[model samples]
Target: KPTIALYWSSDISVNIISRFLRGLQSKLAKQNYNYNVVICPYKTDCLHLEKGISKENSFDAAIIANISNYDLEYLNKASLTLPIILFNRLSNKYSSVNVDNYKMGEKASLLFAKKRYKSAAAILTESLNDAMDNRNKGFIETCHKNGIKISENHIIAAENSIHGGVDAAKKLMKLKNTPKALFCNSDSIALGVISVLNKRQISIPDDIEIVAIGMNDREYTEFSTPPVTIVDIPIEEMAGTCISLVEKLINRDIENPTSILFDGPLILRN
Candidate 1:
């Protein structure tokens, strides 16, 4: 049996990760592949990579997720002669499976334009993530093309958590002029924004409309004050694809690695 190592950063603690893992496990089981999957959840220390690199000869292939650029560069330099696949992030050095963030942002921006929102604010994570950066660029560029100007002050950096959302919303409220629409980089941030606004007696859809990327939780979105609009990410499909690619790599079936981009379907709920 071949051994495949899975390394994921501690930065991602959402339900989506668990869901993806479950899906991957189910798919692997169904295929009855003679492979041993080992998951190493590491912190900012990047200690797992060090350990994995030292034992690179034992593993047939690797799947990495949410690793920082610095750590990624370091790992690439270690010269582990094994196929490495990245998930949910775009990397020029490695094959990756991710959503087309640019398209996702454009779609959401167009929706906001159709709703006649003249001004908007954005909540984004503070980390230097390529996916988030692309999404932010897409939203800003599309908005500009559609005649909606997003001021620099309107963009708030958060920590990709509810607390980050709350803090971002507080800063946004302090702005001289509030935007009619709010764009969240993630559903978790949107939930945090909604909580703060609700506590402050601010009305949703009446005061401001919100749109977020990633449908991490449908129930949370539906039960929120005015049901958040989101770009639905196909996690199950992506997970299956990741597993397939890993299998191919392990079997030495793929040459000239490439990226697989999935589309994010827009879902609007009032």
Candidate 2:
């Protein structure tokens, strides 16, 4: 007999949890295994789960579906004996599912280069998260490869938010050498930038092209004023695969822990 626990963050709403749990439960049902699933949302909620593990409860494994890097880092510090799986913002440790962030940077940079944008800039998180770092690396490298001068002075690094994106866009536009295109690491940031740009009466993909990565949901991009272009991250696929991988780890079926990277595709919103 085996059981699995899914530890999620309270930052997101219960509706989101229910939706994810529904998919997970559906997948587990198809497996026909004698196992149970638990959803733990807070540190307090983890108490019962901790007790179960300490009491040698017949649980096979656990999965952490936390969103923030800070939260994930905190959880990583907490000791849990069961084999674990993580679906988090960024990590070099743990068996997990993630996206090719660097490739996302490269593709977005290339899109601008192909349009012959004379100058470009990237807006990303100021944190030490591996995913953001890799995405910036890819964006910068691709810009260099294309002989496109990236405006380092215009590059903006801030906390993940629409206001951050808007502020970055304002700063980039105010620079001595204004960039004709911008690459943001997240769609929310892009939307913020676009919103500010709209106020300035600057048209997107005309006066300045914009591209963003890590679009967790698609509807926002599709319904934007000029429908923002975005890089699609397959979260559901990653989540489902993560479940399968954690099961294997619990069974001691893995000799070498493998890192899984999912590819992202640009959804041109023309």
Report the poorest 10 consecutive residues by lDDT, candidate 2. Answer: 44-53
lDDT of 2 by residue, 101-156 (tens): 78888888888888887778778756335666777888889999998888667677
The residue pairs in collision within model 2 are none
Q: What lDDT would each prediction earn against the true structure?
A: 0.79, 0.71
Worst 10 residues of 1 by lDDT: 47-56
lDDT of 1 by residue, 178-205 (tens): 9998889888899999989999989888
Per-candidate TM-score against the hidden true structure: 0.88, 0.76
lDDT of 2 at 204: 83
Count clashes in each candidate, considering only residues at least 3 apart in sequence or on different chains: 0, 0
